[PDB]
């Protein structure tokens, strides 16, 4: 279960790469910080709170993915 959040974090940041997220410095800077913290995380308490926060960035701009 702990391996899954880091597993899902890598692909979650990957899908934003070709969504022109890096075109904005503000979004990519904080997205990179969130993604790297999950990989270096050791305790399950804080692992989720970056996971939900980073996914909310994808849902912020609906135009990317048709839910």
């Amino acid at each position: 279960k702990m391996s899954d959040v880091k597993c899902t974090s890598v692909v979650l940041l990957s899908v934003l790469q070709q969504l022109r997220v890096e075109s904005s410095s503000k979004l990519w800077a904080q997205c990179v910080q969130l993604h790297n913290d999950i990989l270096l995380a050791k305790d399950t308490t804080e692992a989720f709170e970056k996971m939900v926060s980073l996914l909310s960035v994808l849902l912020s701009m609906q135009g990317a993915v048709d839910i």
């Binding site: 692909v11 899908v15 996971m51 939900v52 996914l55």
Partner: peptide, 28 residues
């Protein structure tokens, strides 16, 4: 890019997190 997007959503549904499920239904 369709294949990458649809497989990622499978992982999110597989995680079964209340906070993760709350926001995805809110955006839906």
């Amino acid at each position: 890019t369709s294949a990458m997007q649809t497989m990622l959503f499978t992982m999110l549904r597989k995680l079964d997190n209340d906070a993760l499920n709350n926001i995805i239904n809110n955006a839906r």
